[PDB]
Ligand binder design. Structure first.
Ligand SMILES: CCS(=O)(=O)Nc1cccc(-c2cn(C)c(=O)c3ccccc23)c1
Length: 126
């Protein structure tokens, strides 16, 4: 079994910007979610090999995780905050698509998403 390459976190051709919203997303939002008791399964790409999930990447074709988001924020990959917010949303949605309602991982994702949405209500004006 093999995992796919992770999502891109570096691309010298992609224009980059360091907006106050992106700074908030790193310094406040990501940092707070990262320490949550349920964050650990989301801190790196799903390792379908290690977890014996051979169908994971047959079903999930747009993978995303908080480790990738952290690298994108820390390595100035984004142009705007919406790109980052979309990455979080992709992470959560993938979990809800792949797993059954009521699976522990889904409950963990839902708790993180509730927190994420509350925090982004305080995103500063651009
Ligand atoms: C740090 C990423 S890991 O892959 O190295 N470890 C890890 C450990 C426990 C749980 C999962 C996990 C994560 N997600 C997002 C899932 O959807 C999922 C679905 C079924 C079974 C396990 C998981 C991954």
């Amino acid at each position: 079994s093999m995992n796919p390459p992770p999502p891109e976190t570096s691309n010298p051709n992609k224009p980059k910007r360091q907006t106050n919203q992106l700074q908030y997303l790193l310094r406040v939002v990501l940092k707070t979610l990262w320490k949550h008791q349920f964050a650990w399964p989301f801190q790196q790409p799903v390792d379908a090999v290690k977890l014996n999930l051979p169908d994971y990447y047959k079903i999930i074709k747009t993978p995303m995780d908080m480790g990738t988001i952290k690298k994108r924020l820390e390595n100035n990959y984004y142009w705007n905050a919406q790109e980052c917010i979309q990455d979080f949303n992709t992470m959560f949605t993938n979990c809800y698509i792949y797993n059954k309602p009521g699976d522990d991982i889904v409950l963990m994702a839902e708790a993180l998403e509730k927190l994420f949405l509350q925090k982004i209500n305080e995103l500063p004006t651009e």
